[PDB]
Amino acid sequence: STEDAMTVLTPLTEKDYEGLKRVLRSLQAHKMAWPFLEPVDPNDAPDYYGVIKEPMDLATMEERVQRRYYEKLTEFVADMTKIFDNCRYYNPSDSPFYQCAEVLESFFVQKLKGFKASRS
Ligand SMILES: Cn1ncc(NC2CNC2)c(Cl)c1=O
Numbered sequence: 001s002t003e004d005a006m007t008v009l010t011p012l013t014e015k016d017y018e019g020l021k022r023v024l025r026s027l028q029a030h031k032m033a034w035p036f037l038e039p040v041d042p043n044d045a046p047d048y049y050g051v052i053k054e055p056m057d058l059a060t061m062e063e064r065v066q067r068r069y070y071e072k073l074t075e076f077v078a079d080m081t082k083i084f085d086n087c088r089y090y091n092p093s094d095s096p097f098y099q100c101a102e103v104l105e106s107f108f109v110q111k112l113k114g115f116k117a118s119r120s
Pocket of ligand 1: 036038091097
C-alpha cells in the first residue's frame with residue numbers, strides 16, 4: 001500500500017517529527033504506560049539484560065526523537081515494538097506488565113494508523 005511504502009521509504013520531515021512527538025506524548029500519558037516510561041531496573045527482573053537483546057523504553061525513544069535519530073517511520077515503529085515484544089518475551093502472560101504491553105500496543109497501533117494517514 002501507499003502507507004506501507006511511505007513508512008519504509010519516505011524520510012521523516014519536520015512536520016512528521018511534530019506528529020511523532022504527539023504520538024510519543026500520547027503513549028507517555030496513557031494510564032498503562034508507567035511500566036515503560038524508564039528502563040527496567042535489574043532488581044525488578046532477574047537476568048533481564050542477559051535475556052533481552054535490545055532493551056527499549058519510552059524515555060530512550062524520547063531522547064532519540066529529540067536528537068532526530070529516526071530517519072524513517074519504520075525505525076520509530078521498530079523501537080516502540082521492542083518495548084512491547086521485550087515485555088511479552090521476558091514475562092509470563094499473566095504478569096501485569098504483559099497485560100500493560102497488550103493494552104498500550106493496541107493504543108499505539110491506533111495512534112500509528114492515524115499518524116500514517118496524516119502524512120498524505
Ligand atoms: C519484568 N519487568 N520489570 C519492570 C518493568 N518496568 C519497570 C520500569 N519501572 C517499572 C517491566 Cl516493563 C518489566 O517487564
